[PDB]
Amino acid sequence: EELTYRLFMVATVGMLAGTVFLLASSREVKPEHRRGVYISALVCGIAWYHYQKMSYDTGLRYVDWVLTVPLMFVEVLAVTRKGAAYNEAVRNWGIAATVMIGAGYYGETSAAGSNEYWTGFVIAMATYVWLMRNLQAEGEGLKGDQAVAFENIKNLILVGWIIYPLGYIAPVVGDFDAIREVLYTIADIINKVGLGVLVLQMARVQSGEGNIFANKFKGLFGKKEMRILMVGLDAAGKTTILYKLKLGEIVTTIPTIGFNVETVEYKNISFTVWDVGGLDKIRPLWRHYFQNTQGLIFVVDSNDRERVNEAREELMRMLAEDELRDAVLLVFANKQDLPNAMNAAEITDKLGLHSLRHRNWYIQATCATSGDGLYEGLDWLSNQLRNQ
Ligand SMILES: Nc1nc2c(ncn2[C@@H]2O[C@H](COP(=O)(O)OP(=O)(O)O)[C@@H](O)[C@H]2O)c(=O)[nH]1
Ligand SMILES: *C\C=C(C)/C=C/C=C(C)/C=C/C1=C(C)CCCC1(C)C
C-alpha cells in the first residue's frame, strides 16, 4: 500500500523531468532532427498528467497506454518509413496497439483468473507478438550509425515491454496485486523515458556532417522538376559543394575549349555549375543554360576580400538576365572556417543584396568542407521552389 504509492510519486516527477530533459536537449540537435524528440516529450507529458491523478482506478493507466503506445510507434516508424509506407505502418501498428490495450483492459477489469481475464490475455498477446515481429523486421535498409542507434530503439521495446504481460500475469500466480502496479510503473518509467533518450540519442547522431551513405541531402527536394544553377568565381567552392550533396556522380563536359560545365542529376532535380568571369568570349554561351531556371545559387569565397567586388559584378550581371527574372537567389557565403572570413552580414553588405528589388533571396553562411549551412540554405531554397 504505502510502497505502491511511493512509486506513483516518483514516476510523476520522473515523467515531468523526462519532458524537461528532452525539451532542454532539443536545442543541441539540428532542427530537422527534432520531430521525434518533440513527440517523445509529448509521450512523457501525457504520462505525467495521468500519473499525477494515479480504490485504485486502473482505467487511468489504460487511458495512458491507448494514447502513448501508438505515439511511440510514430517516433519509431519515422526512422525507417517515409511516405505511403509510413502512413500504412502507423495505421496498422496503431490499430494493433489499440486492440492490444483494449483487450488488456477488457481482461484486467474482470475478475482475476476468469475466462474474460484469459480471453483478454490471449488476444493481447497475439497482437503483442504481431507488433514485436514487425519491429524486428524494421530497419533492414538502415546502415552505419543510424542502424546501430535504431537497434537500441528496437531492443529497448522488445525487452522493455515484456514487463507488461508479466505484471498482468502476477495477480493470478500469487498474491501480487500491488506487484502489477509496480511492474507497470517501472516499465512505464523505463520505456517512455528510455525511448525518448534513445530518440534523442538518435537525433544527436543523425544531426551531423557524417554522410557516408549519402542520405543527408536526399529528403529535401521531392519529386517536382527543379533546375538549379550554381555559379560563382573560380575557387569559390562550387565543386566541393557538389561532392558534399552526394546526390550523384558529377558529369563534367567541355562543350567548347575554355568552358567547363559540371552537372549533378537526382530524381527530377539538377545542378549546373560553371565559373563566372573569365574571358568575355565565353560569357554569351551561358545563355544556353538559363531557360526555365528555378533556383540561382551564387557561391562566394568569404575569405577572398580582394575579389569580393568582382563577385558582386558577376552576380548583378547574372541577375540582369531576363530568363532569370523569376529565379530564386540563394547566396552561399562559403569558407566561413577561415580566419579572415567575412560574416554573412558583411557579405550581404558588400554584395548589395539589400538593394535587390522584386527578388526572393537568402544568404547562408556555409563551410563546404564540413557541410555546415549547406542543409539550411538548400532547405530554404527547396521550400521556396516547392511552395510556389
Ligand atoms: N576552408 C575551406 N576551404 C574550402 C571550402 N570550400 C572549398 N574550399 C577549398 O577551395 C578549394 C577549391 O574549391 P573548389 O570546390 O574547386 O571551388 P570551385 O572552383 O568553384 O569549384 C579546395 O581546395 C577547397 O579545399 C570551405 O568551406 N572552407
Ligand atoms: C506506457 C506505454 C507502454 C509501452 C505500455 C505498454 C503496454 C503493453 C505492451 C501491455 C500489453 C498487455 C499484454 C501484452 C498482455 C496482457 C494485457 C496487457 C495490456 C498488459
Reduce the secondary structure of the chain to three states and give it as a string: CHHHHHHHHHHHHHHHHHHHHHHHHCCCCCHHHCHHHHHHHHHHHHHHHHHHHCCCCCHHHHHHHHHHHHHHHHHHHHHHCCCHHHHHHHHHHHHHHHHHHHHHHHHHCCCCCCHHHHHHHHHHHHHHHHHHHHHHHCCCCCCHHHHHHHHHHHHHHHHHCCHHHHHHHHHHHCCCHHHHHHHHHHHHHHHHHHHHHHHHHHHHHHCCCCCCCCCCCHHHCCCCCEEEEEEECCCCCHHHHHHHHCCCCCEEEEEECCEEEEEEEECCEEEEEEECCCCCCCHHHHHHHCCCCCEEEEEEECCCCCCHHHHHHHHHHHHCCHHHCCCEEEEEEECCCCCCCCCHHHHHHHHCHHHCCCCCEEEEECECCCCECHHHHHHHHHHHHHCC
DSSP β-bridge partners for residue 376: none
Which of the listed residues 231, 234, 240, 367 should we mutate to test ligand 1's pocket, taking the one with most ligand atoms within 8 A of CB? 240
69 lines ligand 2 (CB under 6 A): yes
Distance CA 237, CA 273 (A): 11
237 lines ligand 1 (CB under 6 A): yes
Whose C-alpha lies nearest to ligand 2, atom 19? 104
Whose C-alpha lies nearest to ligand 2, atom 8? 164
Are 201 and 232 in the same domain? no
104 lines ligand 2 (CB under 6 A): yes
The answer to whether position 178 is within a domain reads yes
Are 40 and 152 in the same domain? yes
The answer to whether position 233 is within a domain reads yes
Atom of ligand 1 nearest to the CA of 243: 15
In a 10 Å sphere around its CB, with 0-12 CB exposed, 13-18 middle and 19+ buried, how is residue 178 labelled? middle
The answer to whether position 338 is within a domain reads yes
Which residue is it, cell 550554381? Answer: 230
Q: What is the largest CA-CA distance in the chain?
A: 93
CATH number at residue 357: 3.40.50.300
Distance CA 184, CA 170 (A): 11
CATH number at residue 148: 1.20.1070.10
Distance CA 341, CA 276 (A): 21
The answer to whether position 120 is within a domain reads yes
Residue 167 CA to ligand 2 center (angstroms) comes to 9
Ligand nearest to the CA of 334: 1
| Torsion angles phi and psi, residue 50, rounded to 5 | -85, -35
Q: Is 237 annotated as a binding residue?
A: yes
Are 231 and 308 in the same domain? yes
Ligand nearest to the CA of 164: 2
Which of the listed residues 65, 132, 186 should we mutate to test ligand 2's pocket, taking the one with most ligand atoms within 8 A of CB? 65
Residue 157 CA to ligand 2 center (angstroms) comes to 11
242 lines ligand 1 (CB under 6 A): no
Spatial neighbors of 61 by CB under 8 A, at least 6 apart, are 50, 54, 184
Strand-by-strand arrangement of the 269-275 sheet: 251-256, 259-266, 269-275, 226-232, 295-301, 328-334, 361-365
Ligand nearest to the CA of 370: 1
Indicate the number of domains in the chain: 2
- The amino acid sitting at 265 is E
Q: Is 335 annotated as a binding residue?
A: yes
Are 45 and 193 in the same domain? yes
Are 13 and 155 in the same domain? yes
Distance CA 58, CA 351 (A): 66
User: Cβ distance 266 to 214 under 8 Å?
Assistant: no
The answer to whether position 211 is within a domain reads no
Boundaries of domain holding 329: 218-386
Whose C-alpha lies nearest to ligand 1, atom 13? 237
Ligand nearest to the CA of 252: 1
Say how far residue 322 (Cα) sits from the centre of its chain. 38
Are 224 and 199 in the same domain? no
User: Cβ distance 22 to 196 under 8 Å?
Assistant: yes
DSSP β-bridge partners for residue 229: 272, 296
Q: Is 239 annotated as a binding residue?
A: yes
168's grid cell = 498482468
Distance CA 316, CA 308 (A): 13
CB count within 10 Å of CB 133 equals 9
235 lines ligand 1 (CB under 6 A): yes
- Given resolution (angstroms): 2.3
Are 370 and 301 in the same domain? yes
Domain end, chosen from 206, 230, 254, is at 206
51 lines ligand 2 (CB under 6 A): no
240 lines ligand 1 (CB under 6 A): yes
- The amino acid sitting at 271 is F
Are 54 and 23 in the same domain? yes
Distance CA 266, CA 371 (A): 19
Are 177 and 260 in the same domain? no
Domain end, chosen from 158, 185, 206, is at 206
Are 57 and 194 in the same domain? yes
Are 161 and 298 in the same domain? no
Distance CA 104, CA 121 (A): 6
Residue 303 CA to ligand 1 center (angstroms) comes to 11
The answer to whether position 119 is within a domain reads yes
Whose C-alpha lies nearest to ligand 1, atom 12? 235
DSSP β-bridge partners for residue 364: 332
Atom of ligand 2 nearest to the CA of 43: 1
Whose C-alpha lies nearest to ligand 1, atom 26? 335
**Nearest Cα to Cα of residue 101 among 150, 138, 132, 62:** 62
Domain end, chosen from 152, 185, 206, is at 206
Are 130 and 237 in the same domain? no
- The amino acid sitting at 358 is H
Ligand nearest to the CA of 110: 2
The answer to whether position 212 is within a domain reads no
